[PDB]
Structures are given as C-alpha cells and as structure tokens.
Amino acid sequence: MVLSEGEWQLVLHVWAKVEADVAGHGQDILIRLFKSHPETLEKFDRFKHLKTEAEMKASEDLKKHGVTVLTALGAILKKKGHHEAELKPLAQSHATKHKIPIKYVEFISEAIIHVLHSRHPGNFGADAQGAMNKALELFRKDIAAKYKELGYQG
Numbered sequence: 001m002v003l004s005e006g007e008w009q010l011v012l013h014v015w016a017k018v019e020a021d022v023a024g025h026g027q028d029i030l031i032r033l034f035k036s037h038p039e040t041l042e043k044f045d046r047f048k049h050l051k052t053e054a055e056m057k058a059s060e061d062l063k064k065h066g067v068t069v070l071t072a073l074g075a076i077l078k079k080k081g082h083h084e085a086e087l088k089p090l091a092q093s094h095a096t097k098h099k100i101p102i103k104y105v106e107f108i109s110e111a112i113i114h115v116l117h118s119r120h121p122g123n124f125g126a127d128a129q130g131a132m133n134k135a136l137e138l139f140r141k142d143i144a145a146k147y148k149e150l151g152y153q154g
C-alpha cells in the first residue's frame, strides 16, 4: 500500500502533539492494551505480576517501556513509508525472541487509535483517524511479510 502526502501530514500532525508528552501517551497506550486484551500482558515477563491499573500506573518500568515503544514507532512513521531498515531488527526481535503474533500488533494498533481519539479529538477527526489506521496497516503488513521471511509468520 501507499499513503498520499496528505495522509502522511494528518498522521504527523497528530503525532507532533503526542510528542509533547511521550511518557504519558506511552503509559496510556500500554495500559489500554493490557485492559482490553489481557492475554497480551502474559508476553511481558517484566510486567506479568502487575494486578491492577493502579499498579500499572505506578510502575516506572512500564512508563520507561512506553517511551521506548513510542520512540521506535515515531521513528518509523517519520520515514513516511521508507522504513525497511528500521523495521528489520524490530521484526527479528518480536518474531524470534519475544514471539509476538501479528494479532497482538493489531491489538496495540487499536489501543493507539483509542488513546489518540480520547486525548486529541480536534486533531483526530474521521479523516485523520483513517490516515493513522492506514499508516498502522502499512506497518502491520510490512512486519507480517518480514515475519514470514524470518520463519515465523505468527
């Protein structure tokens, strides 16, 4: 797939607002994932033990991991589709070391969309949401293709 420049501008305009508070957004997204799809917490040996939303909110390690996730994602989005080099080591660790199925990448995509809609309603109307969904679909398709090349396709 290919996004148009106008689609990329919608994506990078709301992302610019996200970057005003990377740690806050990172925490909101991971907590939303774990609340909506509890099975995903089981892939994180580091976080597995946390029982409640309050415990998640108070975890400094979970907040640090949120910053890592969004910084990596932001670097990929800023490439506007030219992300083959950035994607390779991410696909390799998530297929081979962490063993993350593509369905769970769909689940975090949903979580990102929910948080942006909640925090940025004026910059995340229907057309901006459609553009962000397309950007995340492009990411998912490319990571799936790399999974298959690597021997997982899970």
Ligand code: HEM
Pocket (backbone or CB within 6 Å): 040, 041, 043, 044, 045, 046, 068, 069, 070, 072, 073, 089, 090, 093, 094, 098, 100, 104, 105, 108
């Ligand atoms: C937007 C999609 C994602 C991005 C950008 C992302 C990015 C990252 C990065 C940069 C790391 C650290 C370096 C590495 O190990 O590759 C990491 C670690 C990890 N990711 Fe992801 N990730 C994504 C989705 C997921 C999903 C959906 C899951 C599981 C449901 C997941 C599970 C893990 C685990 C288990 C680790 C290791 C955590 C630890 O340090 O104990 N990732 N991820």
